């Protein structure tokens, strides 16, 4: 669909923060949509990218890829401007075939979304302890 | 024994500090359970590892090993850095014919020695007995 | 400190036993102080040995070590003999710049861990943490 402002609510481990992302246009070379969070100093912004394989008559596999990166700014002595200290990434990839139907893809997506809110993942990501 | 948050109260030299540890799964390679300090960030926090071993063709007796290690953070950049680390480990070694009384006695004896004045003066201050 | 009789109270599983250890001197060849129980036969004693190792060019770390050795005897013959052994070993490592607060924290944390349900189940019942 055509890019639009995306407002996400109830983000955060507390469960109260919100995020508002603005479109940043498509890259013609590889067709990667982009969204960013409003703010000054474009180097300290939260970014989201969405990529989908273009429809073709002879295409075998359809690949959907999503990326997330959140930088943190630390002000240090000897510099007037803040700098990026570390990055927190994410990467979601889906892979279907030409003969798949809509229900399979919707089931996979909803299952992943529900898994990310299960206590197993809430424990394995927030606390970084392996599951055994 | 179920992995669970372990909280230690009234520890430290003064006797007021508390420490709460959170589970971090068990390693499938060597069966070592891990506990990590609640809150904090990785590579800047206290760790505890507990393992229990089975008799095999090399060793004919059980072996329980506990290792605790914790770093000190010093800030000069945005993020802290580790300056030094303090280690400590315990390794009991019982046998297959040992009863529960002996294991409990050894554990309680070790727990009670660390509160004795000898160990207090020989660990806090690094001076031996004379 | 100065070696003297060490008495340990509320020891054992039930928590009503006691134990008194009498000094047995400091070995000059390795600097290991020894505490033993009262008994005529050398092989049936309960021994506690503690040492502190000053840093050298090879190790450049402080190393405090404690050992425990508990034998059990039974008369199968005229006089009892040693059937099995139960061991326990502890060691600490510190750098030259460690403050006494960190060392006390490590000692008290290790003392408090041994009384938690996790260690009680792992050592007494030999149940691995899971």
């Amino acid at each position: 669909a055509k890019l639009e402002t995306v407002t996400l609510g109830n983000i955060g481990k507390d469960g109260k923060q919100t995020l508002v992302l603005n479109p940043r246009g498509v890259n013609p070379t590889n067709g990667v949509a982009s969204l960013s969070q409003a703010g000054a100093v474009p180097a300290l912004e939260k970014r989201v990218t969405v990529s989908v394989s273009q429809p073709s008559r002879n295409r075998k596999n359809y690949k959907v890829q999503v990326k997330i990166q959140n930088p943190t700014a630390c002000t240090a002595n000897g510099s007037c401007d803040p700098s990026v200290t570390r990055q927190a990434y994410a990467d979601v990839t889906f892979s279907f075939t030409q003969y798949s139907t809509d229900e399979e893809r919707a089931f996979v997506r909803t299952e992943l979304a529900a898994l990310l809110a299960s206590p197993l993942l809430i424990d394995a990501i927030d606390q970084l302890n392996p599951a055994y | 024994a179920k992995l669970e948050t372990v909280t230690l109260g009234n520890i430290g030299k003064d006797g007021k500090q508390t420490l709460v540890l959170n589970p971090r799964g068990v390693n499938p390679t060597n069966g070592v359970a891990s506990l990590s300090q609640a809150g904090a960030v990785p590579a800047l926090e206290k760790r505890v590892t507990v393992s229990v071993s089975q008799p095999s063709r090399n060793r004919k007796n059980y072996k329980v090993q506990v290792k605790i290690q914790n770093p000190t953070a010093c800030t000069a950049s945005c993020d802290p850095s580790v300056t030094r680390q303090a280690y400590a480990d315990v390794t009991f070694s019982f046998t297959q014919y040992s009863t529960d009384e002996e294991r409990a006695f050894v554990r309680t004896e070790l727990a009670a020695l660390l509160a004795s004045p000898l160990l207090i003066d020989a660990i806090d201050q690094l001076n031996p007995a004379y | 400190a100065k070696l003297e009789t060490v008495t340990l109270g509320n020891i054992g599983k039930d928590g009503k036993q006691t134990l008194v250890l009498n000094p047995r001197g400091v070995n000059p060849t390795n600097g290991v102080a020894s505490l033993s129980q009262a008994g005529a036969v050398p092989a049936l004693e309960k021994r506690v040995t503690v040492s502190v190792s000053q840093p050298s060019r090879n190790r450049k770390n402080y190393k405090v070590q404690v050992k425990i050795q508990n034998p059990t005897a039974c008369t199968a013959s005229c006089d009892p003999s040693v059937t099995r052994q139960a061991y326990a070993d502890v060691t600490f490592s510190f750098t030259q710049y460690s403050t006494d607060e960190e060392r006390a924290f490590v000692r008290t944390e290790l003392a408090a861990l041994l009384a938690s349900p996790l260690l009680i189940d792992a050592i007494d019942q030999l149940n691995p943490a899971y």
Partner: antibody
Amino acid sequence: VQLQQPGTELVKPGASVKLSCKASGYTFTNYWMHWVKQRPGQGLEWIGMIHPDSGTTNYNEKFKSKATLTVDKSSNTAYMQLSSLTSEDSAVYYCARGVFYINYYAMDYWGQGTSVS
Amino acid sequence: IQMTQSPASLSASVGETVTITCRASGNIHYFLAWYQQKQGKSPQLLVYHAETLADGVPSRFSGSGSGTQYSLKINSLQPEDFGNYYCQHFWSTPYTFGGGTKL
């Protein structure tokens, strides 16, 4: 060392309630906080515990959906949000302060408790 | 681990000693506490290690037992000692309470 509680409150079915709390006389930072429900004539039940340092909750495997626990860092306050109230589970809710010293495991300084219709 | 109290109702009025027993489905290594609730609906703390005692307790209360069987003992019962008694364990996560017993 005492724990203030707002007192009895009345709410219509199918709503959510805050169950506020206040801690005084001690550092709120160090100690756990338990929540206990007592149905009149049915005995005590354990809801869960929370750690003020970082939100580290434990739950009964019951009340998972019904109860959620949060604490604000300053003002020494604890909360207990009940998502759905059919008013069938009308009871008195306490908030004890958990203590976990060596060979000393208990809940002391319980508090007055609040009744919810 | 499930805790249960055997009597669930006791009528001994004054003077005579009383006992309250407890059972656990698993082995808890003395991690047990006893609570007393009067008509004020705010429980107090007792014993807290199945053998020790709290600060305000007049020592007429005493507990014992090991393994999976525990008990509470009262000597020279006095009129103010009337109400409900609950027990719980501290060995695993649920920290389940007991059934309760009324005097």
